[PDB]
Design a binder for this molecule. Structure first.
Ligand SMILES: COC(=O)Cc1cc(Oc2ccccc2OCCn2ccc(=O)[nH]c2=O)c(C)c2cc(C#N)ccc12
Lengths: 547, 401
């Protein structure tokens, strides 16, 4: 017998202060008991488990469905935390094309890696006796049990330690681990590739690991985690938008799942309205009628999902490009590619939850998201194609009160373009009328007034019902913008209004702010000056709006 | 050569912080560095039984193309037991010049407590999560951990004993991996003395706090005032009245009586000139009742002024500034706001380390996603302070300008 190399055990403990599981065994039928006795007999004959005496005080329930199913939920609750290395699956767009790719599934994955002997006593389980007229048969696991908390992590680390020297002495191949399957890829000739696959099967056999003796039953295309992997391209598994007479909540969440999933390769997928119908519902069976915006959006989705689209693999020798397009209502879409019309992947970005916003901020956020995703997938920041003029970005970041930055990018003239809709003046305007505005409201009756007085003797006071102080300050500025020429100075004491306008929004929740924006867009020059209230500053008439 | 027992605070587990994505060049640099360190016993590979993790990335310090390994030990530092203390040298900020030295290598010759090593675990990530991440844990004192200068304090005292006995006029301070050496010599004599101390440390950053002062509130001196000029003056004075008690603005607001155009020139009455002069005299004095409390956090606010100019204030209570400043240095960051902000944060943190011996909590005028996407690209210090993000434009921006 050729000496099998031992696999180093991973020292495992329980959570601090906790003890092993002690759960009462369930009564089983005589048929199930016989089945479990046969299965456990064979497993003991193989070495996966071993019989134990009555000294072991721990127990974990067992079932038969025949196949044995040990319910380790209690031991999982009581087992220490492990370093789970599977967090975020590899994205197909990050893979690099290989001439040959082979799949090797390892038989008896967990049942070939030994378990820490000082921990085996916590895996104890008992098989009930026929009519329970004898003590049940007590067993404990000698290898990683399927369903235990630490089986995937320990299996992955052991497989990594085994595959380390082979990967070191074979730099011309790439190996990838995923559950009980290994994916090897290389650009060598098919003969050299199959040869090195044989060498890998041998190197794994030196540790007692069995690979498919037959030809590997998995051949391209590979169906993996909703993906289709082909020798030269990748895509998502078929996305079918169903025809429904009425759409319920679960149908709409299925639809937004298929659309969110399909959006990573199908460009232009929009999900704003269909997900907007789910706002504050929290009812899985509630039927929600579809708005016309959602029906037209669904028609555009069916038009995009008409025929299959594929993505290419990553070529590290070519530059990485990401182009962004604005879609409206806070929706953005992007393609990441290296050659024109041949996308690596696609995606979308929806604006965050905010009361005020503008397009430049949203474009910046989208660029940051794409940057992080690209560093994840490809390990580098792509060059950007953005629908915004260089001069627009320069004016924005040079005049913005916050720090902001975009990585290397170039302008692409693909409408709609992102632009600055208004710019406030830095110094007061000579020859322009000066509007001193103010607004006030009563906290009880919700009655208020908003108005202005100007240097030319122009005045206005408007009464308002169902209003607040902030609303009357915004309304006062709005009136000043309504009744002034193309150039105007405005003096206010509202720190709230100045805080809104200095954030430079082009779209808001409050229709009042949106009207202020529409007025600013029409002006030539607007200078907004702030003064403290109640300081006896003439012109700023707080008593004119408190009557 | 003998390990000192180190534990965590009662009731606190080890740090379990997610490792953020790194570029390919940084991953390669960390692989090379960590391989070299593993060959030297400074770190060792760990198995999946270690659930703890601390972020790690790579930088390139000043005047060097070699990559350096930086570990974000912030969580481990706040979860590590308090080590005890040496009173802060109040004369370090008074000295004419100070030079910062990196003494991190000296930490790697002292072994780390055996049972504490599992808490220093870090992970070199992989691109696209293809292969598992390379996990390491430290066997010696790691750079960036607060326990490394606390444990090495005795050895550092023994090494620096001859030099401190040789020059009683040279002040020596230590914070994390940095050694601050202050004196009053000439720049050439200071550089030769620094080479003397660095070879003295071998066989075993010009910074001038004297050219730094606290900044007063200044008012304009004009011959003709417009309505806008007086309105801004009254706004700034009303703001300063929160700091200085005797500020009075009624005689200047008396000039704004009537709705006048913003560009109209207004002459100052005698009462207004007297009021403005009294306000100047009040502003010339320091702030009433401003003290430092070592039990409280330091807060640093930064305002972007444009044209590469930045203003900052370090305080503990609102309107009680312990330090104010204006960083306007231009060093290869003319077209990048984030790089400017990051160098500003590093400089302010260094000043705070010199003055009080600890780092402040920053309030950054930047969106969380932008800063968290780009700040590691321009970081060159061995420590990392805490920060939060201000999303509403502060009105007091121009009152510090
Ligand atoms: C962690 O591994 C991954 O997630 C990537 C991963 C890589 C992989 O294959 C590879 C193995 C080693 C290096 C590159 C690989 O893909 C390059 C791109 N590709 C892909 C398919 C093809 O024919 N031809 C190609 O040139 C396979 C075959 C996978 C198969 C399944 C399945 N079922 C799941 C993931 C897989």
């Amino acid at each position: 017998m050729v000496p099998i190399s031992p696999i180093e055990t991973v020292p495992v403990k329980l959570k601090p202060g906790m003890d092993g599981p002690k759960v009462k065994q369930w009564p089983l039928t005589e048929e199930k008991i016989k089945a479990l006795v046969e299965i456990c007999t064979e497993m003991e004959k193989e070495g996966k488990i071993s019989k134990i005496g009555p000294e072991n005080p721990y127990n974990t329930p067992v079932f038969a469905i025949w196949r044995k199913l040990v319910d380790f939920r209690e031991l999982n609750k009581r087992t220490q935390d492990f370093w789970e290395v599977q967090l975020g699956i590899p994205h197909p767009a990050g893979l690099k094309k290989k001439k040959s790719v082979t799949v090797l599934d390892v038989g008896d994955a967990y049942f070939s890696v030994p378990l820490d002997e000082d921990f085996r006593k916590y895996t104890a389980f008992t098989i009930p006796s026929i009519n329970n007229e004898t003590p049940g048969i007590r067993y404990q696991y000698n290898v990683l049990p399927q369903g235990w908390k630490g089986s995937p992590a320990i299996f992955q680390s052991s497989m990594t330690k085994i595959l380390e020297p082979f990967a070191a002495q074979n730099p011309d191949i790439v190996i990838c681990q995923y559950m009980d399957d290994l994916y090897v890829g290389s650009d060598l000739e098919i003969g050299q590739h199959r040869t090195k696959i044989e060498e890998l099967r041998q190197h794994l056999l030196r540790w007692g690991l069995t690979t498919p003796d037959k030809k590997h039953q998995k051949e391209p295309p590979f169906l993996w985690m909703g993906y289709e992997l082909h020798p030269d391209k990748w895509t998502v598994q078929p996305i079918v938008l169903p025809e429904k007479d009425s759409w319920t909540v679960n149908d709409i969440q299925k639809l937004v799942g298929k659309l969110n999933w399909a959006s990573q390769i199908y460009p232009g997928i929009k999900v704003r309205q269909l997900s907007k119908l789910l706002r504050g519902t929290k009812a899985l069976t509630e039927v929600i009628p579809l708005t016309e915006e959602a029906e037209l959006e669904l028609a555009e989705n069916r038009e995009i999902l008409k025929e299959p689209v594929h993505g290419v693999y990553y070529d590290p020798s070519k530059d990485l490009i990401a182009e962004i397009q604005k879609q409206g209502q806070g929706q953005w879409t992007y393609q990441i590619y290296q050659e024109p019309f041949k996308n690596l992947k696609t995606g979308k970005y929806a604006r965050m939850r905010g009361a005020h916003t503008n397009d430049v901020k949203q474009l910046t956020e989208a660029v940051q998201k794409i940057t992080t995703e690209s560093i994840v997938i490809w390990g580098k920041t792509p060059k950007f194609k953005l629908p915004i003029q260089k001069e627009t970005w320069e004016t924005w970041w040079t005049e913005y009160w916050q720090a902001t930055w975009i990585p290397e990018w170039e302008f692409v003239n693909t409408p709609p373009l992102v632009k600055l809709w208004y710019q406030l003046e830095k110094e007061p305007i000579v020859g322009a009328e000066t509007f001193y505005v103010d607004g006030a409201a009563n906290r009880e009756t919700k009655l208020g007034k908003a108005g202005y007085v100007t240097n030319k003797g122009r005045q206005k006071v408007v009464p308002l019902t169902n209003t607040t102080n902030q609303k009357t300050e915004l309304q006062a500025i709005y009136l000043a913008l309504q009744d002034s020429g193309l150039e105007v100075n405005i003096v206010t004491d509202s720190q709230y209004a100045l805080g809104i306008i200095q954030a430079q929004p082009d779209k808001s929740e409050s229709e009042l702010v949106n009207q202020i924006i529409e007025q600013l867009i029409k002006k030539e020059k607007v200078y907004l000056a702030w003064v403290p209230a109640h300081k006896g500053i003439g012109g700023n008439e707080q008593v004119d709006k408190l009557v | 050569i003998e390990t000192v027992p180190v534990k965590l605070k009662p009731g606190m587990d080890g740090p379990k912080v997610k490792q953020w994505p790194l570029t390919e060049e940084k991953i390669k640099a960390l692989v090379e560095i960590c391989t070299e360190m593993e060959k030297e016993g400074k770190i060792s590979k760990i198995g999946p039984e270690n659930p703890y993790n601390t972020p790690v990335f790579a930088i390139k310090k000043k005047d060097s193309t070699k990559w350096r390994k930086l570990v974000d030990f912030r969580e481990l530092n706040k979860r590590t037991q308090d080590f005890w203390g040496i009173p802060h040298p109040a004369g370090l900020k008074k000295k004419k010049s100070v030079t910062v030295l990196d003494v991190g290598d000296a930490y790697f010759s002292v072994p780390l407590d055996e049972d504490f090593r599992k808490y220093t675990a870090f992970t070199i990530p992989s691109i696209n999560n293809e292969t598992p991440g390379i996990r390491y844990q430290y066997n010696v004192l790691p750079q960036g951990w607060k326990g490394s200068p606390a444990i090495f304090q005795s050895s550092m005292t023994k090494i620096l004993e001859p030099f401190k006995k040789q020059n009683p006029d040279i002040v020596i301070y230590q914070y994390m991996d940095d050694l601050y050496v202050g004196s009053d010599l000439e720049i050439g004599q200071h550089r030769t003395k620094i080479e003397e101390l660095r070879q003295h440390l071998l066989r075993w950053y010009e910074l001038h706090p004297d050219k730094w002062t606290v900044q007063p509130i200044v008012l304009p001196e004009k011959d003709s005032w417009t309505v806008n000029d007086i309105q801004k003056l009254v706004g700034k004075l009303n703001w300063a009245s929160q700091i200085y008690p005797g500020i009075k603005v009624r005689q200047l607001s008396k000039l704004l009586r009537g709705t006048k155009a913003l560009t109209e020139v207004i002459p100052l009455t005698e009462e207004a000139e007297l009021e403005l002069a009294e306000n100047r005299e009040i502003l010339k004095e320091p702030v009433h009742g401003v003290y430092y409390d070592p039990s409280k956090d330091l807060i640093a606010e930064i305002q972007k002024q444009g044209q590469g100019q930045w203003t900052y204030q370090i305080y503990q209570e609102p309107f009680k500034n312990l330090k104010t400043g204006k960083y306007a240095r231009m060093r290869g960051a003319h077209t990048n706001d984030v790089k400017q902000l990051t160098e500003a944060v590093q400089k302010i943190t260094t000043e705070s380390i010199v003055i009080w011996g600890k780092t402040p909590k920053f309030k950054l005028p930047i969106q969380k996603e932008t800063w968290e996407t780009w700040w590691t690209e321009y970081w060159q210090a061995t420590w990392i302070p805490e920060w939060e993000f201000v999303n509403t434009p502060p009105l007091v921006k121009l009152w510090y300008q």
